[PDB]
UniProtKB/Swiss-Prot annotation, chain A:
Co-administration of salinamide and rifampicin or salinamide and myxopyronin suppresses the emergence of resistance to both antibiotics. The RNAP catalytic core consists of 2 alpha, 1 beta, 1 beta' and 1 omega subunit. When a sigma factor is associated with the core the holoenzyme is formed, which can initiate transcription. The rRNA transcription and antitermination complex (rrnTAC) consists of RNAP, NusA, NusB, NusE (rpsJ), NusG, SubB, ribosomal protein S4, DNA and precursor rRNA; S4 is more flexible than other subunits. In pull-down experiments interacts with CedA. Acetylated on several lysine residues in the presence of glucose. It comes from the Bacteria. DNA-dependent RNA polymerase (RNAP) catalyzes the transcription of DNA into RNA using the four ribonucleoside triphosphates as substrates. Resistance to the antibiotics salinamide A, salinamide B, rifampicin, streptolydigin, CBR703, myxopyronin, and lipiarmycin can result from mutations in this protein. The chain holds residues 51 to 224 of 1342 of the full protein. It comes from Escherichia coli (strain K12). Belongs to the RNA polymerase beta chain family. This is DNA-directed RNA polymerase subunit beta.
Swiss-Prot record, chain C:
Keywords: Cytoplasm, DNA-binding, Sigma factor, Transcription, Transcription regulation. This is RNA polymerase sigma factor RpoD. GO terms for cellular component: cytosol; cytosolic DNA-directed RNA polymerase complex; sigma factor antagonist complex. It comes from Escherichia coli (strain K12). Residues 77-147 are annotated as: Sigma-70 factor domain-2. Residues 282-297 are annotated as: Interaction with anti-sigma factors.
Swiss-Prot record, chain D:
It comes from Escherichia coli (strain K12). DNA-dependent RNA polymerase (RNAP) catalyzes the transcription of DNA into RNA using the four ribonucleoside triphosphates as substrates. Resistance to the antibiotics salinamide A, salinamide B, rifampicin, streptolydigin, CBR703, myxopyronin, and lipiarmycin can result from mutations in this protein. It comes from the Bacteria. The gene is rpoB. Belongs to the RNA polymerase beta chain family. This is DNA-directed RNA polymerase subunit beta. Acetylated on several lysine residues in the presence of glucose. Co-administration of salinamide and rifampicin or salinamide and myxopyronin suppresses the emergence of resistance to both antibiotics. The chain holds residues 399 to 498 of 1342 of the full protein.
UniProtKB/Swiss-Prot annotation, chain E:
The RNAP catalytic core consists of 2 alpha, 1 beta, 1 beta' and 1 omega subunit. When a sigma factor is associated with the core the holoenzyme is formed, which can initiate transcription. The rRNA transcription and antitermination complex (rrnTAC) consists of RNAP, NusA, NusB, NusE (rpsJ), NusG, SubB, ribosomal protein S4, DNA and precursor rRNA; S4 is more flexible than other subunits. Signal peptide: none annotated. This is DNA-directed RNA polymerase subunit beta'. Belongs to the RNA polymerase beta' chain family. Keywords: Acetylation, Antibiotic resistance, DNA-directed RNA polymerase, Magnesium, Metal-binding, Nucleotidyltransferase, Transcription, Transferase, Zinc. GO terms for molecular function: DNA binding; DNA-directed RNA polymerase activity; magnesium ion binding; zinc ion binding. Changing A733E: Resistant to antibiotics salinamide A and B. The keyword Magnesium applies. Co-administration of salinamide and rifampicin or salinamide and myxopyronin suppresses the emergence of resistance to both antibiotics. It catalyses: RNA(n) + a ribonucleoside 5'-triphosphate = RNA(n+1) + diphosphate. Binds 1 Mg(2+) ion per subunit. One of its GO terms (biological process) is DNA-templated transcription initiation. It comes from Escherichia coli (strain K12). PANTHER family: DNA-DIRECTED RNA POLYMERASE, DNA-DIRECTED RNA POLYMERASE SUBUNIT BETA.
């Protein structure tokens, strides 16, 4: 997943490409007990097959000059022993699973703890796995404000205008 | 032997001047310049000083009087 | 709006000037040349200056308006190429030297290149100035990027070693051993160990320990140059013991022994000096001190002194 | 994918899949649902609901950090490729294992 | 040696005078031979040698050459310790503003120049120009241009124009201004202006200008032209094992400053374009800011790791700064720590110390004894013996600790009794043994707790431990007078078991010749431990002084009470042992013994009580089994009936009669009733159900159920826990607050099903989290209270004041919440106390009311007694012993020197975890309630004026006096009084909580102190805690420490200057010698945080709360801190002026005032 998501690369304005074919895990140099004794990470080498494809100049169709397919070494990834452990520097380690807020949209109005009279100010928050946060909030004067990465507040319609929307079609939507 | 200091506090009072006078007197014994005034019972100089305070043999007034008279007789 | 970022302010101020127009750099170099030529005319029209030049030539073998036109067209060139420095200074952003420091060292390099640029070569200014800017930035990193400065030659050795280790990491698979860098490189293989031993960046003394709450590295470091109270008391007792042992010696033997070693006096004296003070032969003082040390070796006379060992 | 699924569930859409980047429809629908919650029948999401809190295990976190290493090696790969060559470079010299 | 500490601004000349050289290069170490570099941050010529009396180059390696400077390297030869004192300096090529004096909020640079900080920051970062006396023709001095305006005026003006940029411009402005003329003009503005906001701004500006021109400070010093450099040993670059180095962040920040300064010098040498030079000056400014504070500049600069560098300011402020981590507390030699076990054989004055721990803790003493007694020739030999643990080393160790106390301390030292001195008894083990009677004081249990042992070294420390801290001296609480060494659980159970009576017990009815006969009968098995028998018993009574008349009588008691009677001392009545002797009875008995007989008999009695209680609880065989938790037989019936009622009410709700919420409330009520019924049935079945017969049909007696006896005796448990064991455990509320409509019907003897256990965890975790997050704020409150009252000591014997406070029983709702006996016990009467009929002087004026006078008052039914209070004392810098009272830790009056402020803070704070507490925090912070009370500002007739949007203007008119005071009262505030009425001063007009400020302003000091004490005592009483009011009044007196001069008159003060109340009191005392006084004040009331932060000493105020603000204010004002406080002397390592050092301090004054 990681390789497919980011490893294929294109040389900006050069159209020389480096693409990923496959990977494999090499045999660990040491066993677990030997790593515990000497003091080392029980890891397997990562050998990735890459292909550097060179595009002949002025070939928008896809005609390529040559392909250089070679297997290359990309670090050593620590391995998990048979009982869910990692030996990292000869010491047995455990990675504990994390309970975190799931990505998505959440509506989390405060309980009236902001302003007098205990008015409920509603808000929406978009949380991605990777990227910036996108919040919408309400002020006591009953206005809708957009906020990006928890920075200074802005009127919400700004985002709408930034998405190439005019006032008339904005009111048509809402 | 020593468990409580209530007779020494009584005889001197203020619970703080007792500490200072007892420290003066215990240091007097500890350095080879003075001897106990009560029968030593294997006690440390602090306890001996407290036991002398309880007996009334030591006060802040007695100690300074003795210091003064030792100074006066040093002239000889 | 407003910002406190110094780099943002620098970008704001510098970006105002248009980058350049081809054949504009040639004209700016021309203006610089005109200014220096004005200064040269001022110097050549000074008869005393020419007489001094002749005098110095013999030794060897045995204006304001001109400066203004030089300072100007140097401001114009340097400010016209401030974006060139930033493009080739953002390459080194995280080498222990902040971004604006690299920008400023590159700026000094660019100023030097402007000074040494020659337009009659018909060569683009960027090609020449890139060399100087890169030199300035890289030497700046070499000179002031580490707490314990290492010279430029040793940094070149370190970088060569790192490049070759990196290449062998992939050509071999796991890692190169220091003996294996004596083949890829041409070093005695002891220099490799020294270069590898060269201290890495010092650890911050405020480094949190795994707890990360209140345990910092500086909490685990002791004052190594301190006298233990037992050692100081032992020194005092040894001084007293030497005093009380030398007391039990004949007057001249005790004085000789106190002089030969710096015992409660100034620097130790020599046998010749002691004779100069005792008015006797040097060998006589030698015999005296040997006999004194023998007497001090007696049991029931140095049992405490040997207890001091 | 989990993010898209939860996003589409919270907006009462009937597609459990989708894309990873936001759209005009997504943003405007989030604003519309916020407005509906303000006046209509809308329930504040429970942040401590275990249907809202996901579990990350060693495999996922390790994949994320490996992808971090991959992006910070691809930056160098792209910069090196800025000057394409024919027979002087191989797919072993453009990538450095140290960042990963 | 030194009397005070002076803090002021630093001039370039002063910074150069400190310096021993100029740090010219950023180099530190040579990376091959790690010697210091020639002119770097670690330099031998500048900062001193790195080895003792050894020259760096190597031409001088003897103490003989000391005092010469070398020639091949120029390095002075001296000690290496000088590396900790020698400072350098950096000569900045561009002036840089000091970040503290630019970013203080208020900015001293901005306020001094009357320039907004925005404008100053714009000028500093080379964004805009600022005119500098640039001609009095077209542009004013303070005016700021921009690039457009400056270029415009360039060709328009060549001369008589001065607009500069950056910190040099700010320095030029600060140096061209003259303080006296500005102060004069601003005084004229202030005197010819009417606006409170602009008036306040003018007062602040004038105060800065005056405090600046009075001190030697010059404003231009706020711009740093010379930068001091810390000695290298305070920013070390030491080696770590393996060729690694550990360095301080200050090295990196200094290196950045030096690098950028040198680059700026280079650029100015090259005559680089203004843009490059300006960028370099900006960078140098940023570097200096980072070095000083590494904040106040948007983004802190991080090191090789991603963590921000620790700045010069970060090493002084905070919980981790020098003040709190190294000056107020410390790590200490001669200290150990270990797990605590019980050791119930110990006497109250001794503790079990492990032999190895004692051997390590007393090593120098052992070496000394070994040398003195001839067993070791030299100290090294004695060390070798102690290492080998030879047989005689243990004899020496026994001789050493024979009467050497050791201080035992448990981790959270919530009050005084958290440290106590004990005599060590050597134990062959590894766990400290702690007397069972001091555990309550320590709040220590034996489930894994640890304690630290500290050795007192000097004779004074040993005598202090014996005479002040010894566990035998601390048997009464210092918060209340109640005993603190009361037997806790096993002793209570044993005494309760041995003292209660059975109905038909072996040996009942027989007549005994005394307690010895009773003990012989019981121990020989012929009589039961509690068999109702007659016994001849000899009480001793001490009616008059000294004499103990003996009274012999035949008492009807039990065998066990007769046996216990042998433990009791002489002058106590027998009735104290003729009850069942629960926890309350034993505590009252120990208190009676202390108040009648004294301290020594009480200590002996406590030890004997503990021994006897342990012995007889052992003999009792008291245990806990499953059968001992008896469930009511009616529990099933009750739960069925409650469920039927629930079903009925649920149907009624389904019939459209009652809303769901009301049905839920009704269900809650009926379930609570059923829970109460179940608990009552359980207690009836478990308390007295035991039925047996005595030569007859049957009788009834209190149950001998083990759980019941534990709960009833007070040993462990309470009715709540017992009901949770046998009866249902009531209704559970979800942490939100809603009571779960379905209550947990199962107890713990029977199981809880899964749903009930889940519901129970809901609240168990809430309690655990709440207690984990509670002690933090309670500890913060205690810290604030200690800091406000640290400088309060009993300095005088009697002030002579007549003013006091009237103590009356607290009654709320027709019942007494706290009688007068407990409120007036130990306080000196202020004015003569008469009988209600005025018959005669019942008690003289200045008598200390001990329990005899209190008994007399109770007998004669006196409702109100006027007693002296700390808040109304006339002593300057302290309080007399007659205004404090009884010194509740002892029985006698408070001694002179006692630090009563610390005791008050600890007494108020240590119970804060039992608390609620935020209410006490609000009271001591003197926070104003959100919707306060509009009280009557003045007395007179009330009327209304304008009633438009600018809300109603109410006017109160005195009979004769002027009435310009009109209040702008809101309409949505419900008036308590009608429009056309008359109101007295300090009365209530609207309705709401009364702010303490208004109570003080309108009613008085007695009113506000009564308000505070009553409210906080209400909190504590509701929570069951007992604290004397002396302590709350001490805190209130500290809160009332400032006063504002309403009319200076002929005094040397201003109008708005908030002076310290004692200073104005002494001034009004002195000016009575003259005729003119004209000095009148209004007392202020500040919160403890605000009162302690606004104090005379700048060290004591910088030491606890925000240090940057305090240090900057004290620097600009040139404050001089005469120590005269506990914190100040604790910091500088001197005898505190409180206890045994008070005399010393007084003596110092005797020598200072000559
Ligand atoms: Mg415990
Ligand atoms: Zn030298
Ligand atoms: Zn008083």
């Amino acid at each position: 997943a990681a390789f497919r998501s980011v490893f294929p690369i294109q040389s900006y304005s050069g159209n020389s490409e480096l693409q990923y074919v496959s990977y494999r895990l090499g045999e660990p140099v040491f066993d677990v007990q030997e790593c515990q004794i000497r003091g080392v990470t029980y890891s397997a080498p990562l050998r990735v097959k890459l292909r550097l494809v060179i595009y002949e100049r002025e070939a928008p169709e896809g005609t390529v000059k040559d392909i250089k397919e070679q297997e290359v070494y990309m670090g050593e990834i620590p391995l998990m022993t048979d009982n869910g452990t990692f030996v990292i520097n000869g010491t047995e380690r455990v990675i504990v699973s994390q309970l975190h807020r799931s990505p998505g949209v959440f509506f989390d109005s405060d309980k009236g703890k902001t302003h007098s009279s205990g008015k409920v100010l509603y808000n929406a928050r978009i949380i991605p796995y990777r990227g910036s946060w996108l919040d919408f909030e309400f002020d006591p004067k009953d206005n809708l404000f957009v906020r990006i990465d928890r920075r200074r507040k802005l009127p919400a319609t700004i985002i709408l205008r930034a998405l190439n929307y005019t006032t008339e079609q904005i009111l048509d939507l809402f | 032997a020593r468990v409580t200091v209530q007779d020494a506090v009584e005889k001197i009072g203020n619970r703080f001047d007792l500490v200072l006078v007892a420290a003066r007197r215990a240091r007097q014994m500890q350095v080879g310049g003075k001897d106990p005034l009560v029968p030593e019972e294997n006690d440390k100089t602090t306890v001996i000083a407290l036991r002398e305070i309880e007996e009334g043999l030591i006060n802040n007034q007695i100690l300074d009087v003795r210091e003064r008279q030792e100074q006066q007789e040093q002239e000889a | 709006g407003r910002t406190t970022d110094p780099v943002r302010m620098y970008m704001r101020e510098m970006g105002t000037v248009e980058l350049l127009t081809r054949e504009g750099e040639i004209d700016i170099a021309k203006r610089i040349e005109d200014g220096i030529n004005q200064v040269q005319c001022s110097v050549a029209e000074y008869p005393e200056a020419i007489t001094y030049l002749l005098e110095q030539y013999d030794r060897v073998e045995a204006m304001s308006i001109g400066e203004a036109k030089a300072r100007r067209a140097k401001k114009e060139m340097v400010e016209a190429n401030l974006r060139l420095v930033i493009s080739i200074a953002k390459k080194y952003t995280n080498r222990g030297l902040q971004f604006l420091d690299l920008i400023q060292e590159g700026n000094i390099g660019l100023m030097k290149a402007v000074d040494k640029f020659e337009y009659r070569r018909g060569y683009k200014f960027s090609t020449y100035a890139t060399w100087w800017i890169r030199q300035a930035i890289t030497r700046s990193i070499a000179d002031q990027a580490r707490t314990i400065r290492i010279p430029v030659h040793m940094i070149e050795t370190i970088n060569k070693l790192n490049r070759i280790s990196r290449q062998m990491l992939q050509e071999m698979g796991r890692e190169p051993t220091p003996e294996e860098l004596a083949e890829r490189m041409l070093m005695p293989e002891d220099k490799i160990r020294k270069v590898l031993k060269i201290a890495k960046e010092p650890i911050s003394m405020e480094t949190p320990i795994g707890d990360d709450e209140d345990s910092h590295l500086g909490d685990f470091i002791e004052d190594t140059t301190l006298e233990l109270p037992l050692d100081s008391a032992t020194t005092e007792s040894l001084r007293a013991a030497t005093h009380d042992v030398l007391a039990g010696l004949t007057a001249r033997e005790a004085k000789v022994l106190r002089m030969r070693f710096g015992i409660d006096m100034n620097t130790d004296y020599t046998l010749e000096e002691v004779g100069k003070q005792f008015d006797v032969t040097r060998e006589r003082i030698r015999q005296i001190e040997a006999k004194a040390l023998r007497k001090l070796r007696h049991p029931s006379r140095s049992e405490v002194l040997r207890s001091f060992l | 994918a989990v993010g898209r699924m939860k996003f589409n569930r919270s907006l009462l859409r009937e597609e459990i899949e989708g894309s990873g980047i936001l759209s005009k429809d997504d943003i405007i629908d989030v604003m519309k649902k916020l407005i509906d919650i303000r006046n209509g029948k809308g329930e504040v999401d429970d942040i401590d609901h275990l249907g809202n809190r996901r579990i990350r295990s060693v495999g996922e976190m390790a994949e994320n950090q490996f992808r971090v290493g991959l992006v910070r090696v691809e930056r160098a790969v792209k910069e090196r490729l800025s000057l394409g060559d024919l027979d002087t470079l191989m797919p072993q010299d453009m990538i450095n294992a140290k960042p990963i | 040696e030194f009397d005070a500490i002076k803090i002021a601004l630093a001039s370039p000349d002063m910074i150069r005078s400190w310096s021993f050289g100029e740090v010219k290069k950023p180099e530190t170490i040579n990376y091959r031979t790690f010697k210091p570099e020639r002119d770097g941050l670690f330099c031998a010529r500048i900062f001193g040698p790195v080895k003792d009396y050894e020259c760096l180059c190597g031409k001088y390696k003897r103490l003989k050459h000391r005092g010469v400077i070398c020639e091949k390297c120029g390095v002075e030869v001296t000690q290496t310790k000088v590396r900790r004192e020698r400072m350098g300096h950096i000569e900045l090529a561009s002036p840089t503003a000091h970040i503290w004096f630019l970013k203080s909020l208020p900015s001293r640079i901005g306020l001094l120049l009357d320039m907004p900080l925005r404008d100053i920051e714009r000028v500093l970062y080379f964004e805009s120009y600022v005119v500098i006396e640039g001609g009095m023709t077209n542009l004013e001095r303070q005016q700021i241009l921009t690039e457009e305006q400056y270029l415009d005026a360039l060709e328009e003006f060549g001369d008589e124009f001065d607009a500069k940029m950056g910190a040099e411009a700010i320095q030029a402005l600060l140096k061209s201004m003259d303080l006296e003329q500005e102060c004069e003009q601003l005084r004229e503005e202030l005197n010819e202006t009417n606006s409170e906001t602009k008036r306040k701004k003018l007062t602040k500006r004038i105060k800065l200008l005056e405090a600046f021109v009075q001190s030697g400070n010059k404003p231009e010093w706020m711009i740093l032209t010379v930068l001091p450099v810390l000695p290298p040993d305070l920013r070390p670059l030491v080696p770590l094992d393996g060729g690694r180095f550990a360095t301080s962040d200050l090295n990196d920040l200094y290196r950045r400053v030096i690098n950028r300064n040198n680059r700026l010098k280079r650029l100015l040498d090259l005559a680089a374009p203004d843009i490059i030079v300006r960028n370099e000056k900006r960078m140098l400014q940023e570097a200096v800011d980072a070095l000083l504070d590494n904040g106040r500049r948007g983004r802190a600069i991080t090191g090789s790791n991603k963590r921000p560098l620790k700045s010069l300011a970060d090493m002084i402020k905070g919980k981790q700064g020098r003040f709190r981590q190294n000056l107020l507390g410390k790590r200490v030699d001669y200290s150990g720590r270990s797990v605590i076990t019980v050791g119930p054989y110990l006497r109250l004055h001794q503790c079990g110390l492990p032999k190895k721990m004692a051997l390590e803790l007393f090593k120098p003493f052992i070496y000394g004894k070994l040398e003195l007694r001839g067993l070791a020739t030299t100290i090294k030999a004695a060390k070798k013996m102690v290492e080998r643990e030879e047989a005689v080393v243990w004899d020496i160790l026994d001789e050493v600790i024979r009467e050497h106390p050791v201080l035992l301390n448990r981790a959270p030292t919530l009050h005084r009794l958290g440290i106590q001195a004990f005599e060590p008894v050597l134990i062959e083990g590894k766990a400290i043994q702690l007397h069972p009677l001091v555990c309550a004081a320590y709040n220590a249990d034996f489930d894994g707790d640890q304690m630290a042992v500290h050795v007192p070294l000097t004779l004074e420390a040993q005598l202090e431990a014996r005479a002040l801290m010894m566990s035998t001296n601390n048997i009464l609480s210092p918060a209340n007078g109640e005993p603190i060494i009361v037997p806790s659980q096993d002793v209570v159970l044993g005494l309760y078991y041995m003292t209660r009576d059975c109905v038909n017990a072996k040996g009942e009815g027989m007549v005994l010749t005394g307690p010895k006969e009773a003990e012989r009968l019981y121990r020989s098995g012929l009589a039961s431990l509690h068999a109702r028998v007659k016994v001849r018993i000899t009480e001793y009574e001490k009616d008059a002084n000294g004499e103990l008349v003996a009274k012999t009588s035949l008492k009807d008691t039990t065998v066990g009470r007769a046996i216990l009677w042998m433990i009791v001392p002489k002058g106590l009545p027998y009735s104290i042992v003729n009850q069942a002797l629960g926890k309350k009875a034993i505590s009252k008995m120990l208190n009676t013994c202390y108040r009648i007989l004294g301290l020594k008999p009480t200590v002996i009695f406590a030890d004997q009580i503990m021994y006897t209680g342990f012995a007889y609880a052992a003999r009792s065989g008291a245990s806990v089994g499953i059968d001992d938790m008896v469930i009511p037989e009616k529990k099933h019936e009750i739960i069925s009936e409650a469920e039927a009622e629930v079903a009925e009410i649920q149907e009624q709700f389904q019939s459209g009669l009652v809303t769901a919420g009301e049905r839920y409330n009704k269900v809650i009520d009926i379930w609570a009733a059923a829970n109460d019924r179940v608990s009552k049935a359980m207690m009836d079945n478990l308390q007295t159900e035991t039925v047996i017969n005595r030569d007859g049909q049957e009788e009834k007696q209190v149950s001998f159920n083990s759980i019941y006896m534990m709960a009833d005796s007070g040993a462990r448990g309470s009715a709540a826990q017992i009901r949770q064991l046998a009866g249902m455990r009531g209704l559970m509320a979800k942490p939100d607050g809603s009571i779960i409509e379905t209550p947990i019907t199962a107890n713990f003897r029977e199981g809880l099903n899964v749903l009930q256990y889940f519901i129970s965890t809901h609240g168990a975790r809430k309690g655990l989290a709440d207690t984990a997050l509670k002690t933090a704020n309670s500890g913060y409150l205690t810290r604030r209270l200690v800091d406000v009252a640290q400088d309060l000591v009993v300095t005088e014997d009697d002030c002579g004041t007549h003013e006091g406070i009237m103590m009356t029983p607290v009654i709320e709702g027709g019942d007494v919440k706290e009688p007068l006996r407990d409120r007036v016990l130990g306080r000196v009467t202020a004015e003569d106390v008469l009988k209600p009929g005025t018959a005669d002087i019942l008690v003289p004026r200045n008598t200390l009311l001990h329990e005899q006078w209190c008994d007399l008052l109770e007998e004669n039914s006196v409702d109100a007694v006027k007693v002296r209070s700390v808040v109304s004392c006339d002593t300057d810098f302290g309080v007399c012993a007659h205004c404090y009272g009884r010194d509740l830790a002892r029985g006698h009056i408070i001694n002179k020197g006692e630090a009563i402020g610390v005791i008050a803070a600890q007494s108020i704070g240590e119970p804060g975890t039992q608390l609620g507490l935020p209410r006490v925090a609000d009271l001591f912070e003197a926070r104003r309630p959100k919707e306060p009370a509009i009280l009557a500002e003045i007395s007179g007739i009330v009327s209304f004026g304008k009633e438009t949007k600018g809300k109603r203007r109410l006017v109160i008119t005195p009979v004769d006096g002027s009435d310009p005071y009109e209040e702008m009262i809101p309409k949505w505030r419900q008036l308590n009084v009608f429009e056309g009425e008359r109101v007295e001063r300090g009365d209530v007009i609207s309705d709401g909580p009364e702010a303490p400020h208004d109570i003080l302003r309108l009613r008085g000091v007695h009113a506000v102190t009564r308000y505070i004490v009553n409210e906080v005592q209400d909190v504590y009483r509701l929570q069951g805690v007992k604290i004397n009011d002396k302590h709350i009044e001490v805190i209130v007196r500290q809160m009332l420490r400032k006063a504002t001069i309403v009319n200076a008159g002929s005094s040397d003060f201003l109008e708005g200057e908030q002076v310290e109340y004692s200073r104005v009191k002494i001034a009004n005392r002195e000016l009575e010698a003259n005729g003119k006084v004209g000095a009148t004040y209004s007392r202020d009331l500040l919160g403890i945080t605000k009162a302690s932060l606004a104090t005379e000493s700048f060290i004591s105020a910088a030491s606890f709360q925000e240090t940057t603000r305090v240090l900057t204010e004290a620097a600009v004002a040139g404050k001089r801190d005469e120590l005269r406080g506990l914190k100040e002397n604790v910091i500088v390592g001197r005898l505190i002026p409180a206890g045994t050092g008070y005399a010393y301090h007084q003596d110092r004054m005797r020598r200072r005032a000559a």
